[PDB]
Each structure stands twice: as structure tokens, then as C-alpha cells.
Design a protein around this ligand. Sequence first.
Ligand SMILES: CCCCCCCC/C=C\CCCCCCCC(=O)O[C@H](COC(=O)CCCCCCC/C=C/CCCCCCCC)COP(=O)(O)OCCN
Lengths: 83, 71
Amino acid sequence: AGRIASFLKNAWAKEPVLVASFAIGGLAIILPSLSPYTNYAIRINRATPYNYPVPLRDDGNMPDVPSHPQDPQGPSLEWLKNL
Amino acid sequence: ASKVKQDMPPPGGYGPIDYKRNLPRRGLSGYSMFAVGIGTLLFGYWSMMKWNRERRRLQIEDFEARIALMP
Ligand SMILES: CCCCCCCC/C=C\CCCCCCCC(=O)O[C@H](COC(=O)CCCCCCC/C=C/CCCCCCCC)COP(=O)(O)OCCN
């Protein structure tokens, strides 16, 4: 409580560069685990179509696969437009 | 027959001559400069976040153009 206060004061008086560096590194380590937009970053990465989407051979038992891109089925990037 | 004329200080004397150091403070507080820097960083971060999200959307759009043209 007071020991850490005196140590931090001495460090800020003598080595401000090291204090700033350690603070920045600690924030960089800690903050990503508490952010709600990391999931958004992952989903943005998954949403980029680098390669061709190969169609599946219809067998009559896929209610959740579209037969046309404009069909309502499949993933939607409506969330991405407002983000 | 004239007075004695010589190089002399004026009657009374000379005006004061400054010699002491003069290095005025002329500076802001540390908190002020740190706050300005942090605020500038936050403004830049927000602008870059918006711009990069828009860029990702544009990249997706042209990738889909490629996908449409591929067959
Ligand atoms: C959890 C973060 C970890 C990752 C982030 C770090 C990123 C990179 C930073 C580290 C780089 C290497 C650091 C090496 C430290 C060496 C310390 C040392 O021995 O140097 C001392 C000087 O420093 C010291 O006195 C010893 C350490 C002093 C404290 C330094 C910071 C310790 C932690 C304080 C910050 C805590 C976090 C910030 C909180 C903010 C406050 C709310 C000797 O200096 P000389 O150059 O030899 O002197 C010659 C002239 N007289």
C-alpha cells in the first residue's frame, strides 16, 4: 500500500521511461481479454472469402443451405454493415 | 582659457545595467501535455477503427466480385 506507493514514486522520479514501458506492456497483455470486440475481430477475419465457396451436391435433406446467394438461408453480414 | 574637457560619466550617473540570469519558466504543467497526448491518441484510434472497418467491408465486396467472376 505505502511501500508500493513509495517504490512507484521513486521509479517515476528516476526511470519514467521504464514505468511507461511496463504500464503499456501490462495494458497490452491485460486489456484484450476484457474486450467485447475481440469476438468481432475474429468474426471479421472469418467473413473474408479468400477462396471460392464450392457448392454442395443437393440430396434433398439440407433445409439450412441456400440454393441461391439471395436466398434467406446461410450466414449474413448484416451485423458488419452497422459495425 | 576654457574648462577642462574629458570623457566623463554624465552628471548623476548611468542607468542600471542588468547582469543577473533571466531564464523564464514559460511552460505548461506535465498533466496538461500528457492529457493532450492521450486525447490525440484516442481521437486517432477512433478514426482509424472506423476507417479500417470500412476498408474490410470494401475488401469483402471486391473479393465477392472475384468469386462471381471465377467460374
Ligand atoms: C507486465 C509488463 C511486462 C511486459 C512489458 C515490458 C516491455 C519492455 C520493458 C522492459 C524492458 C527491459 C527492462 C529492464 C529493466 C532493468 C532495470 C535496471 O536495472 O535499470 C536500473 C534503473 O532502474 C532501476 O532503478 C530498477 C527498476 C526501477 C523501476 C522500473 C519500473 C518497475 C515497475 C514500475 C511500473 C509498474 C507498472 C506501471 C503502473 C502505473 C502506476 C499506477 C539501472 O539503470 P542504469 O542505466 O544502469 O543507471 C545508470 C545511471 N545511474
